[PDB]
Ligand binder design. Structure first.
Ligand code: Y01
Ligand code: Y01
Ligand code: WHJ
Ligand code: 2CV
Ligand code: 2CV
Ligand code: 2CV
Ligand code: 2CV
Ligand code: NA
Length: 286
């Protein structure tokens, strides 16, 4: 009884710390590699930096707080931090998918109008783009949460809101559908639509330079496909819940949300497809 709990707590604390380490180390590396390698200070990599920041915030704040909930079996940190934690969670996934959209648009523009791209895309504008994404994402995530537009009137929902060790994020049906559409589905569609036009246009194309570019494009494609595989199961289940809470087992709904957090560890590994990133990682780790 108390032994079975001790074994589980200690083994889970350790797995959690591993995830935290991998997310934080991997994304600090990406940021430091870009922040100290001129060859890597392209405009596209400014968006990559932004994406690393969303992942870094998941590593430093989102996962650590989720970890304490899974390991200790209650929320230890009070009402405010529960709301803040929830806000940052929604914020990071919103920021990530909107950033992946920008990246897909960046590539579409550079490939179909390399001359308009040259005169339009500057560092100052890349900066404005990045901040606009974070602004919108802040908008979509903080306010509805701080204005309590997510709450429900249910017996189960009020059972959680007064209990100070509950932080389940039980929402009303309107918020579930609205946030899912606004924070995830709409940008997911834009990104797919644009990513395929990039596919077509890259395929409707010296040989060595073209092979090198198509390698980098494929890396971005993999970044986008893995993000989709990590979050689509959760958002598919979030919706299906609205209509029938019996269709999908709870343990699996929880699992899919963690698969979402997990995505934050995957991009630095995926960037090892690049010799330039690989060499900068080797140079930084000393
Ligand atoms: C606790 C939560 C709310 C986290 C808040 C994070 C944001 C404030 C971060 C995430 C991504 C960051 C951005 C990532 C990339 C850039 C590009 C960067 O462009 C540069 O001039 C530096 C690169 C160079 O040109 O050498 C300027 C900072 C900026 C806008 C950062 C500003 C701060 C941002 C928006
Ligand atoms: C709230 C959800 C449902 C909307 C998700 C849409 C976003 C993922 C993307 C789609 C196209 C993106 C926009 C495409 C182009 C621009 C112009 C861009 O660059 C500038 O405006 C700089 C120009 C300057 O100030 O000189 C600012 C960001 C913005 C609005 C982007 C912000 C994010 C947008 C709206
Ligand atoms: C299923 O078990 C868990 C595990 C962790 C958590 C923390 C909460 C804050 N997770 C939020 C989730 O990542 C999310 C992110 C972004 C969204 O737009 C979300 N919309 C929802 O309706 C419901 C959830 C939702 C909540 C429930
Ligand atoms: C949850 C995170 C939320 C991030 C919120 C982003 C805030 C909106 C963006 C913003 O504040 N700026 C646009 C940045 O693109 C201000 C900058 O323009 C500022 O640096 C200017 O004062 C100077 O450019 C002029 O000297
Ligand atoms: C970007 C996301 C923006 C979503 C904002 C949606 C807020 C809608 C308000 C809302 O739906 N409720 C009030 C919360 O302020 C809760 C009700 O759905 C529910 O509690 C009861 O009315 C039940 O009886 C079901 O009808
Ligand atoms: C386009 C806007 C359509 C509104 C979407 C609201 C879905 C409401 C359906 C629903 O709540 N259930 C499915 C009912 O079959 C489950 C209920 O049975 C329980 O209360
Ligand atoms: C309230 C009870 C909910 C408990 C849910 C906790 C699940 C543990 C989360 C976790 O750290 N992983 C499983 C994810 O759920 C491991 C991840 O690193 C995983 O994604 C990778 O191992 C694979 O992607 C590649 O091998
Ligand atoms: Na509570």
């Amino acid at each position: 009884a108390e032994l079975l709990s001790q074994q589980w707590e200690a083994g889970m604390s350790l797995l959690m710390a591993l995830v935290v380490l991998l997310i934080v180390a991997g994304n600090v590396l990406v940021i430091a590699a870009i922040g100290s390698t001129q060859r890597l200070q392209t405009l596209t990599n400014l968006f990559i930096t932004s994406l690393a920041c969303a992942d870094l915030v998941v590593g430093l704040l989102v996962v650590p707080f989720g970890a304490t909930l899974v390991v200790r079996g209650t929320w230890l940190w009070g009402s405010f931090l529960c709301e803040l934690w929830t806000s940052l969670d929604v914020l990071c996934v919103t920021a990530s998918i909107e950033t992946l959209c920008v990246i897909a648009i960046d590539r579409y523009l550079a490939i179909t109008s390399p001359f308009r791209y040259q005169s339009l895309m500057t560092r100052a504008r890349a900066k404005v783009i990045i901040c606009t994404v974070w602004a919108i994402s802040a908008l979509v995530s903080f306010l509805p949460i701080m204005m309590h537009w997510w709450r429900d009137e249910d017996p189960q929902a009020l059972k959680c809101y007064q209990d100070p060790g509950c932080c389940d994020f039980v929402t009303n049906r309107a918020y579930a559908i609205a946030s899912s559409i606004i924070s995830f589905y709409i940008p997911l569609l834009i990104m797919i639509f644009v990513a395929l036009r990039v596919y077509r246009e890259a395929k409707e194309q010296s040989r060595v330079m073209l092979m090198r570019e198509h390698k980098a494009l494929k890396t971005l494609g993999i970044i986008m496909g893995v993000f989709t595989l990590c979050w689509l199961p959760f958002f598919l289940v979030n919706i299906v819940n609205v209509f029938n809470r019996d269709l999908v087992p709870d343990w699996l709904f929880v699992a899919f949300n963690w698969l979402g957090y997990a995505n934050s560890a995957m991009n630095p590994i995926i960037y090892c497809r690049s010799p330039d990133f690989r060499k900068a990682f080797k140079r930084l780790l000393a």
